[PDB]
Amino acid sequence: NKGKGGKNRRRGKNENESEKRELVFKEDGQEYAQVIKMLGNGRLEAMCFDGVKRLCHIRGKLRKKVWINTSDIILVGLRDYQDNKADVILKYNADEARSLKAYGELPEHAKI
Amino acid sequence: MGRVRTKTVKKAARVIIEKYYTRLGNDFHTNKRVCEEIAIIPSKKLRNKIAGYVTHLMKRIQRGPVRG
Amino acid sequence: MAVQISKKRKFVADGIFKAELNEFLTRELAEDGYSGVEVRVTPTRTEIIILATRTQNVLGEKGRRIRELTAVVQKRFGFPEGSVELYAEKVATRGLCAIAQAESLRYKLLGGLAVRRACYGVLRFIMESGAKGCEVVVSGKLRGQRAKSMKFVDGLMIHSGDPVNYYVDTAVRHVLLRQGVLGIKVKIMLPWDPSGKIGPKKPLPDHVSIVEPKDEILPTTPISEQK
RNA sequence: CGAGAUGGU
């Protein structure tokens, strides 16, 4: 279907971010966050909605696939040690982020 | 355009002249009849091309040597 | 048939009949070495002639399978009782038939023999049988999860122009192993045979041949000879 | 002898 970059490289399998994108909520050890700044080297600064800011890292599965950006909404996994640091699990589209807030899942802080 | 003759024509014409020089001459319409009885040629259109180069070679052999 | 059908429909329907009969026999007689069917008509009677390498398997213990096959051919195609007869016939020069070589390679692979040992096994037997050349191909998941192919070739092989319709014999087949399907393709190039039915009677279009001159005397002197 | 940088799948 429609490309949205432009290049020779048709050598991959297509992204298909479609159909049964079943909505995901927290388990134990997770938080929702908004991206505040993006740094070099595959890392970023993020704020979760109960107010603890963290330095955050892209998991190896999301490399060069799920492009994160400033003010974007993400799902983050906490560590049982080293509480200043965490890893990204998912990105929510602006269509999914409004459904989280419609289920009352997010405080009235997140931008959409 | 292009009227160059392929090796299938040029080799068959040489082998005919080596064996049957005493039968041949300058008349294309007589050479065309001789080449039909001394050889098996699958096509009428190939027979005409072989008798054509045989007729060209007879007119050369009347002047001097041909190396093949 | 209360009024006869038109010739366009008649000639197409006779071809559709031969196609379905060949498919039924292909999958019934696969291990029994089938290679073709021929059908002929005479007043009140149709005779079907069937070619195989092991004709006793086509008959069975006292002719049971010929009687069972006669019954189902009559039952399915709507012939009246007793108007159908089946005759089994033995294949001549079975190394020069592409379908019998594609099936015997399929059963040799299905028994677990290694791919290169099997493929050079048929390549030798075709060239010892007197073909001018051949080409055997196998493709699919040969050794690993990513697909591959192998070509095995010997002698002469043409690809273009009209002579391909009578100098080359070809078959294609499938074999199912525990990891998925493999393909087999077989091609054989036939010898020229002026009369004898090993191969075609018509020569290749660019094979000119010259008759040899004989028995002349160079010297002469004038003489007369009366009867 | 005009101007002609750059590179997720």
Added chain:
RNA sequence: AGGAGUGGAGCCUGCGGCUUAAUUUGACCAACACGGGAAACCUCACCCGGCCCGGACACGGACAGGAUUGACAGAUUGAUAGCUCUUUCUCGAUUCUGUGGGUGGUGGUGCAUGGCCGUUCUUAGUUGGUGGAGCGAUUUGUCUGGUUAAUUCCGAUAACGAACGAGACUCUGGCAUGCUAACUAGUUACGCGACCCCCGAGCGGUCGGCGUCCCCCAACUUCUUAGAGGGACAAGUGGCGUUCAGCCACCCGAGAUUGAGCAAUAACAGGUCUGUGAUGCCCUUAGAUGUCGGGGCUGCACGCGCGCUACACUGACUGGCUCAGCGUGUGCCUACCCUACGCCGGCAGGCGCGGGUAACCCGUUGAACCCCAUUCGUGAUGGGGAUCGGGGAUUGCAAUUAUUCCCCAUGAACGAGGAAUUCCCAGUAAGUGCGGGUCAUAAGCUUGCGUUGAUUAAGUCCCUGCCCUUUGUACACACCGCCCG
């Protein structure tokens, strides 16, 4: 160098975005009138509801005062689904029930595969054996030059002798008063026969003219069909060529390039699991991801692609005259075909009654542009025909979100199109209409056929690309590369 354009207008149709219960989905030069994809139902995969087993077989249980099957009426229901509820007849070992195991799926993965197709790539390219050269990856053969549409030929030569592609080959177009021979094809002629005209030397005639008017137990194969052979070779003459291989002009001739099919080695994470009883693994399997009723695929601020009709006088309208070629036709489950002639109606259409399983009947296939005469008069006009009101037929089980067709009325933008950009060299481009596919109903698409018939070239490497050789490199994921502060 030029021709017809496309991009600008209205409408048709495919795609994105938005909207929605759903607007099912693949594909981004080599996607977008493409999936033979013209969806009323079916197709059908999507959305809202409801019946059904079409759960083999094995083991255990239950069971001939009986395992199980089917149903009237009232309530219920979109419903004449005994689906379910109340009631009480009916069938007869075929089922039911628990466990194990199967079976089906237009479900998922084309980045697990087969088969098929497209593309690199329409160009001239590709490879062993024995011998020679290098420690080696590799190389020569497969070439300095000339010639050709061509790795086509000549020739040269540490290589010799071969294989595939090219070409040959198959179908097709143009010629035969020569051959074979025709009541499912014609001509000529007459025994003649018949209607009409005197225009004709001359009468109303033997004799003339006109005929798809009619017999032949006449003669024949020019015109039609289609089998066998024939014919063209750079063969002849003049120039140019390391005088070879070839190239240019001209005579004679139906004809001195007719147009297609088939096509190598090695590749691509190209497309297809939605063509298949081709297929691995995964998922689902009785409150089903295996049948009926209704809805959607057509939804509309907006961006893009292939097309149809036009902006008029080299025209539009109303009469009159006169010429094609390629095809299809009573459906074998599956239930329908092509039509002459007569009658009723302005029209679309209706009734009756015949021929055709087809060189036999529709049919001498009375095609359109074109041709001859008339009206309008430079006016958004008698150019253009979008949009919209009212009425009548035909298909179908059903036409509203208008199936298609006919009639009166209404009368938009548009006056030859900005930056850009496509296709084409002769019976070709463009104009013009007719068959086939899909089809119960129906082309603004596509695949074939005939008819009218030009302007400009006979060249080049400039732009975009392809082939071969020499050359440089920090590239090999191969310039859409690599890399510095």
